[PDB]
Symmetry: C2
């Protein structure tokens, strides 16, 4: 009556092949980009173009990726769940929980002024929290429980996406014209990246697919380069454009308040 | 070369004694209080005295406690971690992650007006997120890793407590006189309850103590009755007093803006 574990990273694997090389190279590249962006944002801080949100995101991502590179499978980075015989990437989900709220806070503070926050920002944060928590619970469970939690997380995510779309449209119609193009791209980067995470979940060992750990982590690396680093670069670019507009227009941005939008789409 | 699990709730335990009876009675009582407060807040919603935060907190607490009563040890409510041989109360920590942000959001929105949120509210939310995530990581790990994560969570918690103290002092010096007493009590209920969670952690199977699951859960039940239900009742009471003041004073609360405080203590 023995019990062998058979979790990811316990039995020795012949880590060879082009896919593993690409995997490690992409982790190293993401770490390097994150740390470089961290330094660059630290230098840009004094010009009020890079807020604490992007710096924190880059910092946390750098630690995430260094732990991935050197201790991907040693706990607590890998949570080994016994009865379900599952391997949860707890480092990945912890990084999600840290950053996604900060990404949404930066989105709600795209310009940096005071008094622009609203109750809907807090509701957005709550929905994102629920979505990611239910994703973790689905990852740590099996069977119908996992599917139910995935569905609840999907509902939370639909609400979160609707709120974020409202924020993006408001930013587009309030921010100066010079930023409009940038905003569109950022929105794409927001939706192209985020939407990747739910699908990999279905295709990986978590969920009901059969992706290798390396392929799933490669997809997550790309989705992180998109959702975090590119999104932060766009955020910093937009803030720089806003600073230039402030310099050209006596320091004040155009003032729109107590209006309505979102008609039709 | 066999491996027996020995997690909480696997080997049959003779669930008998006065302590178990008190344990189950307190879980049932907390569930009943939470659901009753949920209904009561739903009725009070239309008078703008009970916000969505307390309703959500009561709702989530009711589900937490029903799952505790009926499936405390079945996963995903109990995460069984293999190499570390630990039993993480994932339902408890999920409920923490859901509610603590909402409690802080309600604290930052004690009055309910628009434009009262600030960047410091978002930083507070980030610090609370980090604190609870590090608490979970410590719970799921062992040895020096757990101690290090506990220390980082403690630092996050000190920052969170400092921010909350600032919020409480601002509420005390901005809200009407009639509410001052209430505010003090709420602060106590906030600090008496929250400070209980770090200590039980040290004394339980999580951490480095030897509390029984039942005693730890009893302590957590009391700390939840204090931090959530009593705190929500005080929040609703304060909002009712504010509504009365608004009725007596043409609907507007006293207006204080762009001032400073926190000198000395
Ligand atoms: C892979 C699929 C996701 C990538 C495409 C996302 C996309 O089109 O978003 C950009 C667009 C940009 O739209 P937007 O609202 O960010 O830009 C506003 C532009 N005006 C005001 C002129 C309309 O966003 C969406 O269409 C988001 C819809 C939800 C997508 C997820 C479901
Ligand atoms: C068990 C220990 C915690 C219980 C006591 C908490 C307490 O005294 O808090 C109420 C008090 C009430 O203070 P307060 O700042 O909420 O009330 C403001 C009242 N004036 C402006 C007149 C000073 O809060 C604290 O002292 C919090 C300090 C941090 C406690 C945790 C360390
Ligand atoms: C930096 C990391 C980010 C932005 C991660 C985002 C992750 C998601 C949006 C995940 C969503 C979901 C799952 C992965 C599974 C359950 C269903 C969702 C939609 C909540
Ligand atoms: C509704 C539940 C609440 C308010 C739970 C609160 C929990 C804490 C404040 C926990 C704090 C910590 C630990 C339990 C362990 C690690 C150190 C702390 C301070 C982050």
């Amino acid at each position: 009556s023995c019990y062998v574990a058979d979790f990811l990273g316990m039995h020795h694997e012949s880590h060879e092949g082009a896919l593993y090389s690409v995997y490690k190279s992409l982790e190293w590249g993401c770490f390097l980009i994150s740390i470089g962006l961290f330094v660059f944002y630290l230098q840009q801080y004094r010009k009020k173009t890079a807020g604490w949100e992007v710096i924190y995101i880059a910092f946390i991502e750098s630690f995430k990726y260094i732990f991935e590179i050197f201790w991907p499978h040693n706990n607590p980075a890998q949570l080994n769940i016994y009865g379900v015989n599952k391997s949860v990437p707890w480092v990945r989900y912890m990084e999600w929980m840290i950053t996604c709220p900060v990404i949404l806070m930066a989105l709600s503070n795209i310009s940096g002024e005071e008094g622009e926050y609203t109750h809907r920002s807090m509701q957005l944060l709550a929905t994102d929290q629920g979505a990611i928590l239910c994703a973790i619970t689905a990852a740590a469970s099996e069977g119908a429980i996992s599917a139910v939690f995935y569905a609840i997380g999907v509902c939370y995510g639909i609400c979160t996406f609707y709120f974020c779309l409202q924020i993006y449209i408001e930013a587009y119609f309030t921010l100066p014209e010079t930023c409009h193009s940038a905003v569109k791209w950022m929105a794409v980067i927001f939706y192209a990246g985020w939407l990747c995470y739910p699908c990999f979940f279905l295709a990986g060992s978590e969920g009901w697919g059969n992706l290798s750990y390396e392929g799933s982590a490669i997809g997550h690396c790309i989705a992180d380069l998109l959702s975090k680093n590119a999104w932060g670069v766009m955020h910093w670019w937009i803030r720089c454009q806003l600073e230039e507009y402030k310099h050209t227009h006596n320091g004040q941005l155009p003032h729109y308040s107590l209006e309505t939008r979102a008609k039709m789409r």
